[PDB]
Amino acid sequence: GEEEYQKMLENLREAEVKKNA
């Protein structure tokens, strides 16, 4: 669960970067 949440978080907070990408 923790692993699934972390690996998903690295992509969630990154999902915002799409604009700045």
From Swiss-Prot:
Pfam families: Toxin_36 (PF10550). GO terms for cellular component: extracellular region; host cell postsynaptic membrane. Its main location: secreted. Conantokins inhibit N-methyl-D-aspartate (NMDA) receptors. This toxin inhibits both NR2A/GRIN2A and NR2B/GRIN2B subunits of N-methyl-D-aspartate (NMDA) receptor-mediated calcium influx in central nervous system neurons. Induces sleep-like symptoms in young mice and hyperactivity in older mice. GO terms for molecular function: ion channel regulator activity; metal ion binding; toxin activity. The lineage of its organism: Eukaryota, Metazoa, Spiralia, Lophotrochozoa, Mollusca. Keywords: Amidation, Calcium, Gamma-carboxyglutamic acid, Ion channel impairing toxin, Ionotropic glutamate receptor inhibitor, Magnesium, Metal-binding, Neurotoxin, Pharmaceutical, Postsynaptic neurotoxin, Secreted, Toxin. Adopts an alpha-helical conformation in presence and in absence of divalent cations. Coiled coil: none annotated. It is found in: Secreted. The modification 4-carboxyglutamate is found at residues 3-4, 10, 14. The record marks 5 as: Important for selectivity. A divalent metal cation binds at residues 10, 14. It comes from Conus tulipa. Belongs to the conotoxin B superfamily. This is Conantokin-T.
